[PDB]
Amino acid sequence: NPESADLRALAKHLYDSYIKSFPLTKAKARAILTGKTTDKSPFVIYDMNSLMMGEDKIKEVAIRIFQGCQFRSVEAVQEITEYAKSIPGFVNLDLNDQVTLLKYGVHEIIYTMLASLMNKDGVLISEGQGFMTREFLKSLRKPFGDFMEPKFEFAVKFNALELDDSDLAIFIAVIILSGDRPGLLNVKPIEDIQDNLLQALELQLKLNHPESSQLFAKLLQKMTDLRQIVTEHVQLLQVIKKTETDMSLHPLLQEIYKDL
Ligand SMILES: CC(C)(c1cc(Cl)c(O)c(Cl)c1)c1cc(Cl)c(O)c(Cl)c1
């Protein structure tokens, strides 16, 4: 199995860069989320009072929340970018294509990973020091009431796959190296890499979840739900910028969303 060996090694490599690039792994998240802890347990924000009291420990309000999420996104992009660099082959591509892959692949990954920080009842924030309930979010005045919902929706179905960090590291790699993205100057070197990634992913999922029939197909199919989330988000923003023309947007995100 020297063929296999090569892939395993690649899987191992991606996991490592993953752990090195992302401060809040699904493992830390699930530990805080469940209570393996007298030391990890989060402060919960579930209403306006606790919001005010959460602020005690570490604009408007619905807007203040939204811009916090937006800024975390910016921070998240930085992380993913550092991770991509580590994907064997990626930095060797046409610079323009590197930029194009990041442009499209970054949100998909954000939400995939955002799922690690959620369960049906809500989502970790402030690096896990806090926990905002799904219900508090819905309560936010339209249109912000609607922004975390579709994300929770995905995370619930997605989390059902029970992927761990090591499966995810390969999966976000497969996402970045997507050849079908618009305006790619040079697709084939991309497809060749992703073939390898896909091969690695496949192997990884059956070694690590052998009693889980067709998880690979099941997991590949989730990429439809991701683009939907992304699309709605972008629709949501098109609207916000017209109702709240006093609310800013981070130029980086502005650039990612442009012509998306
Ligand atoms: C709310 C949440 C989960 C988030 C993150 C991203 Cl990246 C995102 O794009 C969206 Cl809409 C929501 C978040 C917010 C903060 Cl302030 C934080 O420190 C952490 Cl660890 C997580």
Author numbering: 205 to 262, 275 to 476
Quote what the paper states about this structure:
Recently, Somm et al. (2009) showed that perinatal exposure to BPA altered early adipogenesis in the rat, which is mediated by peroxisome proliferator–activated receptor γ (PPARγ), a nuclear hormone receptor whose dysregulation is involved in the onset of diabetes and obesity. We provide the first experimental evidence that flame retardants TBBPA and TCBPA are ligands and partial agonists of human PPARγ and also activate the corresponding zebrafish and Xenopus receptors. Full agonists of PPARγ (e.g., rosiglitazone) have been reported to fully activate their cognate receptor by directly interacting with and stabilizing helix H12, whereas compounds that do not directly contact H12 behave as weak or partial agonists by stabilizing other regions of the LBD, including H3 and the β-sheet S1/S2.
The closely related tetrachlorobisphenol A (TCBPA) is also used as a flame retardant, but in much lower quantities than TBBPA (< 10 000 tons/year), and its presence in environmental samples has been unequivocally demonstrated. TCBPA was soaked into a PPARγ apo-crystal by adding 0.5 µL TCBPA at a concentration of 1 mM suspended in well solution directly to the crystal drop. The crystals were soaked for 4 days. We collected diffraction data at the ID14-1 beamline at 2.55 Å and 2.70 Å resolution for TBBPA-PPARγ and TCBPA-PPARγ complexes, respectively, using an ADSC Quantum Q210 CCD detector at the European Synchrotron Radiation facility (ESRF, Grenoble, France). Omission of Fo-Fc difference maps for the TBBPA and TCBPA structures revealed clear density for the ligands that could be positioned unambiguously into the PPARγ ligand-binding pocket (LBP). The hydroxyl group from cycle A interacts with the main chain nitrogen atom of Ser342 (β-sheet S1/S2), whereas the second one (cycle B) is hydrogen-bonded to Ser289 in H3 and Tyr473 from H12 through a water-mediated hydrogen bond network. The half maximal inhibitory concentration (IC50) values for rosiglitazone, TBBPA, and TCBPA were 12.0 nM, 0.7 μM, and 6.0 μM, respectively.
